[PDB]
Amino acid sequence: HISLNPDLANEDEVNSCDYWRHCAVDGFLCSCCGGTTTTCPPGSTPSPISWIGTCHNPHDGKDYLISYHDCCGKTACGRCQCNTQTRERPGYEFFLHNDVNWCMANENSTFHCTTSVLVGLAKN
Amino acid sequence: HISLNPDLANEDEVNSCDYWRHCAVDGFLCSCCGGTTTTCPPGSTPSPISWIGTCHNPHDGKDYLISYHDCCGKTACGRCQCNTQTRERPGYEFFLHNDVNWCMANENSTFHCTTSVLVGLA
Amino acid sequence: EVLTGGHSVSAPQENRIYVMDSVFMHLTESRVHVYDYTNGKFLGMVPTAFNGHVQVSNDGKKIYTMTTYHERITRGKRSDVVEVWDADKLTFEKEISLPPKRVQGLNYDGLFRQTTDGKFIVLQNASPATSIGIVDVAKGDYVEDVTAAAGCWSVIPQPNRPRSFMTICGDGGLLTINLGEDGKVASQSRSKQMFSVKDDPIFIAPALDKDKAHFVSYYGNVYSADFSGDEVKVDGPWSLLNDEDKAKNWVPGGYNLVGLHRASGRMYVFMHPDGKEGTHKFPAAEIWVMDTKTKQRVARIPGRDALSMTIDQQRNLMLTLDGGNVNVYDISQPEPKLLRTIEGAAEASLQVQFHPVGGT
Amino acid sequence: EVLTGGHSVSAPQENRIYVMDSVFMHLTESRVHVYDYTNGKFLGMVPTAFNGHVQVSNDGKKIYTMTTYHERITRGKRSDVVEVWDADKLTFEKEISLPPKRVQGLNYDGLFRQTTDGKFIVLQNASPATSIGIVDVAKGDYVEDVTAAAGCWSVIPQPNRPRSFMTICGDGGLLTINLGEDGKVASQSRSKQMFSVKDDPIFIAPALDKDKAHFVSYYGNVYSADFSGDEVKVDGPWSLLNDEDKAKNWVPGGYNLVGLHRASGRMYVFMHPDGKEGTHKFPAAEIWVMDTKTKQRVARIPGRDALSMTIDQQRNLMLTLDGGNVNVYDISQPEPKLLRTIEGAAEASLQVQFHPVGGT
Ligand SMILES: *C(=O)Cc1ccccc1
Ligand SMILES: *C(=O)Cc1ccccc1
């Protein structure tokens, strides 16, 4: 349970690039930017689109689908920059790719930070 | 005197904040930004206005009037940042003041770099 | 889980501070960083384009920024603006057009201020000719241009009057402007000379009391402007320095370099030894704590290379700022006590401000 | 003395390189830094707003940038553009309007290219649906989307044809597009599957010859697309790795991570040991030099933590780039020789390019 609920967990843990659900983040962790893992910092707008990663949970041993939605429309947060690439693939598998700005379709495409939204267990 | 002609001097000497004529420079020296002491880097525009002051030349023992014109209309050069303050005064002595953007009246006021133009003897 | 927006800042207003990051290396992406001073937590930010300036509304509800845009940043038409932002949602609400002469420069408090009653923003222009611009916040309009202030610099609000402020002029005196309820000049007055511009220049940063302001000089003198009446009465110098201090050439240095704790009369000043021509912006070796009633120093502490400060009266706090890091001090007693340092609060900031809690 | 503008770059074109600084920390102020590779001297720069991309015209006269503006940066109307800059004066000449879907992303070469004849700029779009955009440089016009490239990514020009290019598609094959004189698609073809997207994904960066391109995979295999004939012939894998290499889990890693020296057939690749899922963008422990004819490694040298490279066929040089520093190598012999390192060429660059010399 606690492994799946970052708001209860240690902030130093969730604000680390090694936190299990941040396994394909290329950008600033929103939880270090005045937001949380699932809420944009005030005045930044969620992206409707994202890259997706599957990350291994070290507690329950299961793999989970993570949607790396960005928060957009504010200039770069600059804090907790990560560049993790587990299962990341190039732009010919576009929704697995994290070298593009997933704010690209927002009303304002300026990239602020990246979130790590837990969708559920990897599909089976 | 050689001390008056930075284009004839060693570039490391001229690109230093302790070069004698850079005595009230707040910003990036244009000579480190693809320009020279008296020429803007390509595609950046001289400011028609500037802060001014005098600097002492320890090489010839004389004091010179300097005009600290900026080059403008390109984003920050980032190189050779100085913040020297000899005889610099606040905004109520406006033309002696270097905490304002002397690109403020240019067609594009984005600050690129600053320099130290030798006007003559003080 | 679902990512949501629309959230407010997670800490109460009374915890918030505003670190104006010029980002001088990339000055077109200046911003305000919002921190919780109690724990160092980053709370959010407001983008401010080229060389932004910032203040918080006196009622605490809004953040005001001042900035310059161009259609294509480095080319195209210039737009100088004030923006109104919600303080809790950190969202843009309104743009107020300014004439294309708002001051572009480092973040001294006095370049972007407001009347005590909060109804008017009062800002410094330079074209390079100087004037003071007045913005009516409710109307969202630039309503007055105080050409009487030509050759003067910076805005010192009078906290004992609703719409009055002073500016430092080229004669070494102060011009006082009293605005009407429409934001137009209702009256003005000029003080006698307070300081010699040539012989004893003052730093522009006031140590501001409710009815008077103190200023420190390049050589460590103190001047005051008493505005308990309609006519400002000026005095000084008295010296910050005793004979021992003079022997080591102690002088003030910094940017927003002074503060006043109003309840006690203590004035805080950044100082450094080996003063000489050209050292007026040097980082603090020490912070000196002066009793403005007795005109004597009461304490001195390490300066942590600070350049700018600000004071919160009601919680008895002082923040200092070295360009990148913010130090939080308890000043409830004459010796400041360091509580914490917020590292990496900015890349290039010369200004920090508390969220106002005192109301209007 | 008088400060003047209007000056040209001080070093001749053949000395120049272009370091695309994303300035990711302040991505709205990205820029191109121009350096002299022969002595490390900074020559100038071109501002490129939010996440700029850059290339030099094949004829060496102009710099092309691609960027995004908004009326108020973080709000207001979006303008995606290509800009044409004079190479010698580093001045803006022309803006070419794009639809608001130009690719925003890291600076892989293949996102912003041109036809061999120089007549068309060929760029990647993502809305997030992908298409290729064609810009007629003569006309200053956007032609239309190459919708046939949906589900594909990046642009690999065919150097043996005037206005043809390929893209890598999600089926693991290549789509070839042949433009007419108006920049519209005249014909196209699709290769057979070259690589398994699931089992042996390739890096997009080509090692490009005049009539063929090689690609390396996440697991250190090599694939090729030969476009000497009417239609593309694909092959691979062959392995970069011997037994010893495999035992230490050597694999490629980087961004613009490969290069081809066309006259010798030597392929340059950044490699690191202890490869596993997630290490494909790791800095180079080494640079390996492969003979593409013999399919054997001919040299291995320290990687200097490089991530991206570029090759100059006319001077037999390789540049490498670790994000901030540029290394200059002589590659006229199988073992590269390090000539110098240019420190601090960028804050956050993943792409360096030579100013073109010759190349007809
Ligand atoms: C993820 O969206 C962060 C990012 C932004 C811009 C370019 C590359 C990656
Ligand atoms: C001098 O003009 C450099 C500068 C630019 C912007 C603000 C302050 C100083």
Indicate the domain borders of chain C: 12-355
D301, D332 in Cβ contact below 8 A? no
CA angle B5-B11-B17, nearest 5°? 90
Residue D314: HSE in the Cβ half-sphere, 13 Å Cα cutoff: 9
Are the C-beta atoms of residues C327 and C346 closer than 8 Å to each other?
Answer: no
CB D130, CB D124: distance < 8 Å: yes
Contacts of residue C243, Cβ cutoff 8 Å, sequence gap at least 6: none
Where b means 16+ CB within 10 Å and e means fewer, A69-89 reads: bbbbbbbbbbbbbbebbbebb
Which residues of D line the annotated binding site for substrate?
Answer: 24, 27, 51
Residue that has been written with the tokens 């002492």 in this structure: B56
> Side chain identity at B2, as an amino acid letter?
I
- CA separation for the pair D112, D133 (Å, rounded): 10
User: Is residue D128 within 8 Å of residue D139, measured between CB atoms?
Assistant: no
Q: Which residues pair with residue C97 across a beta bridge?
A: C81
CB A66 within 8 A of CB A20: no
Q: What tokens were used for C277?
A: 């021509």
Q: Are B64 and C67 in contact (CB under 8 A)?
A: no
Instruction: Using alpha carbons, select from C348, C353, C329 the residue that is nearest to residue C256.
Output: C353
C-alpha–C-alpha distance, residues C340 and C330, integer Å: 10
B111 contacts B27 by C-beta, under 8 angstroms: yes
The answer to whether C184 and C144 are in contact (CB under 8 A) is yes
Give CATH superfamily name and number for C12-355.
YVTN repeat-like/Quinoprotein amine dehydrogenase (2.130.10.10)
Q: Which of A80, A101, A100, A84 is nearest to A33 (CA)?
A: A80
Residue B13 three-state SS: helix
B51 is catalytic: yes
* Cα–Cα dist C222/C209, whole Å: 14
Of the candidates D226, D196, D222, D232, the residue with the CA atom closest to the CA atom of residue D209:
D226
For the record, the structure tokens of D44 come out as 């100038």
Q: Which residues contact D229 (CB under 8 A, 6 or more apart)?
A: none
The half-sphere exposure of D138 on its side-chain side, counting CA atoms within 13 A, is 8
Query: DSSP class of residue C8?
Result: P
Distance CA A76, CA A113 (A): 7
Residues B20 and B56: their CA atoms lie apart, in Å, by 7
How many residues can be counted in chain B? 122
Query: Closest residue of B to C75, CA-based?
Result: B108
Match 């090599």 to its residue by tokens: D222
How far is D205 from D223, CA to CA, in rounded Å? 12
Peptide bond into C128 cis (omega under 30): yes
Is B7 one of the catalytic residues?
A: no
Q: C72 — contact with chain D (CB < 8 Å)? A: yes
> By C-alpha distance, which of D145, D125, D134, D128 is closest to D96?
D134
- Asked if D183 and D136 touch (Cβ cutoff 8 Å), the reply is yes
Give the separation between CA D24 and CA C70, rounded to whole angstroms: 21
Strand order in the sheet with D221-226: D207-208, D212-216, D221-226, D233-239
User: Angle CA(D234)–CA(D238)–CA(D242) in degrees, nearest 5?
Assistant: 170
- CA-nearest of C260, C259, C283, C256 to C271 is C283
Distance from the alpha carbon of residue C101 to the mean position of ligand 2, in angstroms: 15
Show the tokens assigned to D149.
């490239």
Structure tokens at D10: 């001080």
One-letter amino acid identity for C218? Y
Please check whether residue D288 is in contact with residue D233, taking contact to mean a CB–CB distance below 8 angstroms. no
Taking residue D309's Cβ as centre, other Cβ atoms within 10 Å add up to 26
Nearest CA to D173 out of D201, D194, D198 is that of D194
Rounded distance between C-alpha atoms, residue C17 and residue C40, angstroms: 10
Q: How far apart (Å, rounded) are the C-alpha atoms in residues C297 and C136?
A: 42
- Cα three-residue angle A22-A25-A27, rounded to 5 degrees: 130
Contact partners for chain D, using 3 or more CB pairs closer than 8 A, are: A, B, C
Task: Pull the structure tokens for residue B26.
Answer: 């707040």
Distance CA C27, CA C33 (A): 15
Ligand 2 centroid vs B110 CA: distance in angstroms?
9
| Separation between Cα atoms, residue D322 and residue D257, nearest integer Å | 11
Chains B and A touch (3+ CB pairs under 8 A): no
- Alpha carbons C113 and D210: distance in angstroms, whole number: 64
How many Å apart are CA A77 and CA A30, to the nearest integer?
8
Strands laid side by side in the C326-330 sheet: C308-312, C317-321, C326-330, C337-342
Q: Is D31 close to B75, i.e. CB distance below 8 A?
A: yes
**For chain C, what is the radius of gyration of the CA atoms?**
20
Phi, psi of D117 (to 5 degrees): -75, -5
Q: Shortest CB distance from B43 goes to which of D4, D29, D90?
A: D90
Backbone angles phi, psi at D163, to 5 degrees: -150, 50
Give the CA radius of gyration of chain A. 13
DSSP C244-308: HHHHTT-EE--SS-EEEETTTTEEEEEEESS--TT-TTPPPSEEEEEETTTTEEEEEEE-TT--E
Which of the residues A20, A51, A60, A102 is marked catalytic? A51
> Which numbered ligand comes closest to the C-alpha of C51?
2
Distance from B59 to chain D by nearest Cα, in Å? 19
Give me the DSSP letters along B42-63: TT-EEEEEEEEEEEEETTTTEE
Does the beta-carbon distance from D105 to A93 stay under 8 Å?
no
Q: How far apart are CA C36 and CA C57, in angstroms?
A: 18
Alpha helices for C10-139 (secondary structure H): none
- Alpha-carbon distance of A113 to A115, in angstroms, equals 7
Method: X-ray
Tokens at B86, concatenated: 């000899």
What is the Cα–Cα distance from C290 to C121, expressed in whole angstroms?
31
**Resolution of the structure, angstroms:** 1.4
Helices (H) and strands (E) in chain D, counts: 1, 29
C118: left (phi over 0), alpha (psi -120 to 50) or beta: left
Angstrom distance (rounded) from CA B31 to CA B25? 13
Q: Which residues of B touch C104 (CB under 8 A)?
A: 100-101, 103-104, 109, 111
**Alpha carbon separation from A32 to A48, A113, B36, C41, D302 (Å, rounded):** 21, 9, 43, 8, 36
SS3 D144: strand
Q: Which two tokens stand for residue D3?
A: 């400060």
CA distance D122 to D119: 10
Question: How many CB atoms neighbour CB D189 within 10 A?
Answer: 14
Q: Rounded to 5 degrees, what are φ and ψ at D244?
A: -60, -45
Question: Long-range pairs for C128-136 at CB < 8 Å and ≥24 separation?
Answer: C128/B49, C128/B94, C128/B95, C128/B100, C128/B104, C128/B105, C130/B91, C130/B94, C131/C101, C132/C167, C132/C177, C133/C98, C133/C99, C133/C102, C134/C179, C134/C183, C134/C184, C135/C82, C135/C96, C135/C98, C135/C183, C136/C182, C136/C183
Is there a contact between D217 and D200 (Cβ–Cβ < 8 Å)?
yes
Residue A62, classified by CB atoms within 10 Å of its CB into exposed (0-12), middle (13-18) or buried (19+), is exposed
Q: Is A3 helix (H, G, I), strand (E, B) or coil?
A: helix
C208 close to C155: Cβ distance less than 8 angstroms: no
> Is the distance from the beta carbon of residue B27 to the nearest atom of ligand 2 less than 6 Å?
yes
Report the residue count for chain A.
124
Q: Which of B60, B70, B99, B102 is flagged as catalytic?
A: B70
Tokens 């290729």 label which residue? Answer: D132
Q: Which residue has the tokens 């057979």?
A: D192
CA atoms of D203 and D216, how far apart (whole Å): 6
Residue-range domains of chain B with CATH: 1-122 (2.60.30.10)
Reduced to 3 states (helix: H, G, I; strand: E, B; else coil), residue D197 is: coil
Question: And the tokens for B23?
Answer: 């005595």
For residue D214, give Cα distances in angstroms to D204, D207, D226, D235, D240.
10, 5, 9, 9, 12
Buried b (16+ CB within 10 A) or exposed e, B49-76: bbbbbbbbbeeeeeebebbbbbbbbbbb
Q: What are the residues facing D288 on neighbouring strands?
A: D269, D300
Q: Which residues pair with D113 in a beta bridge?
A: D122
| Rg of the Cα atoms in chain B | 13
Contact A43 C29 (CB under 8 A): no
Interchain proximity A100–D278, CB inside 8 Å: no
CB atoms within 10 A of CB D198: 9
Q: Half-sphere exposure of residue C295, counting CA atoms within 13 Å on the CB side?
A: 13
Q: How many CB pairs under 8 A join B and C?
A: 102
CA distance C341 to C242: 31
Which residues are within 8 A (CB) of A98 and not within 5 positions of it... i.e. 6 or more apart? A24, A25, A26, A27, A51, A53, A68, A85, A88
CA separation for the pair A103, D30 (Å, rounded):
17
Would you say the CB of residue B70 lies under 6 angstroms from ligand 2? yes
> Which residues lie closer than 8 Å to C246 by C-beta, 6 or more apart?
none
Q: C199 CB contacts (<8 Å, ≥6 apart)?
A: none
Rounded CA-CA distance A86/D268 in Å is 25
Give yes or no for residue B68 CB within 6 A of ligand 2: no
What does the alpha-carbon distance between residue A61 and residue A69 come to, in Å, rounded to a whole number? 24
Q: What angle do CA A102, A104, A105 make, to 5 degrees?
A: 110
| Cis peptide leading into residue C99 (ω within 30°) | no
d(CA D324, CA A44): 30
Q: Which two tokens stand for residue C161?
A: 């009057």
Check CB contact under 8 Å for C278 and B73. Answer: no
Ligand nearest to the CA of residue B97, numbered in listed order: 2
- DSSP per-residue string spanning D118-138: SSEEEEEEESSSEEEEEEETT
Indicate the pairing of strand C337-342 with strand C349-354: unpaired
φ, ψ for residue A21, nearest 5 deg: -85, -5
At D60, give phi and psi (nearest 5°).
75, 5
- For C230, other C-beta atoms within 10 Å of its C-beta total 11
For C78, residues 6+ apart whose C-beta sits below 8 A from its C-beta are B108, B109, C68, C69, C70, C100
Cα C261 from Cα C271, distance rounded (Å): 18
Q: Give the CA angle between residues D149, D154, D156 to the nearest 5°.
A: 100
For residues D30 and D23, the answer to whether their CB atoms sit within 8 Å is yes
